[PDB]
């Protein structure tokens, strides 16, 4: 479980939060 | 990810007298349009840093640190975010610093689920007597009156329903390490 990817501020492409913010 | 509340928790910056800026790897994470609330433990110590926080979120809460120039900041605050009542104090009032019984009394007096404090420049995130205690550390790695080699850190709370997921960000040289701690209200 890589918390660099899985955190709400992640800048990683694979991040679900990152995906969430992208939608605007 | 809709219906979450993201709360930045940071403090003990000590800009500009001890440090000039947050670390670059932290500023890359701290971007506008993500965080809903900021709970700052104080020791900014000047308006420049306040203005910086306002760029990250509109809703900025600060309590008075021992070194803050702005004597209008309150000594302590209690806020409600989601299901959680959250207390905030800088923590120089607690002697010895971080003292558990002292903090647990503040928790009772404030009547809070989560107590946030600072001053030690050491991160904390732990459960005691079914309440949650946070210290974000110093976001700049500023020295304190006892300690010189401080790891920069800040915290982000992800609040949803009766759970808070607390993320701790630490700068180890110049690589970021993230930890996650979950708390569920009893």
Author numbering:
A (entry chain B): 134 to 157
B (entry chain A): -3 to 182
Question: From the publication, what sentences describe this entry?
Answer:
To understand how VPS29 interacts with TBC1d5 in more detail, we determined a 1.5 Å crystal structure of the complex of full-length human VPS29 and the Ins1 peptide (residues 132–158 and a C-terminal His6 tag). In the complex with Ins1, the structure of VPS29 is very similar to previously reported structures of isolated VPS29 (root mean squared deviation=1.2 Å for 170 aa) and VPS29 bound to VPS35 (root mean squared deviation=0.7 Å for 182 aa). In all three structures, VPS29 adopts a phophoesterase fold, with a central β-sandwich flanked by two α-helices (α1 and α2) on one side and a third (α3) on the opposite side. The second patch is formed by multiple conserved residues including L2, L25, V27, L152 and Y165, which form a surface-exposed hydrophobic cavity. Ins1 binds in a surface groove on VPS29 that centres around this cavity, positioning TBC1d5 and VPS35 on opposite surfaces of VPS29. The Ins1 peptide can be divided into three distinct regions based on secondary structure: the N-terminal part (residues 134–137) forms an unstructured coil, the middle region (aa 138–148) makes multiple sharp turns on the VPS29 surface and the C-terminal segment (residues 148–157) forms 1.5 turns of α-helix. Recognition of Ins1 by VPS29 is predominately achieved through hydrophobic interactions. The side chain of L142 inserts into a deep and narrow cavity formed by L2, L25, V27, I31, L152 and Y165 of VPS29. Immediately preceding L142, P141 makes van der Waals contacts with L152, Y163 and Y165 of VPS29, and also helps to make a sharp turn, to allow L142 to contact the hydrophobic residues from VPS29. In addition, from the C-terminal region of Ins1, W150, F154 and F156 of TBC1d5 form a hydrophobic cluster on one face of the helix and pack against L2 of VPS29.
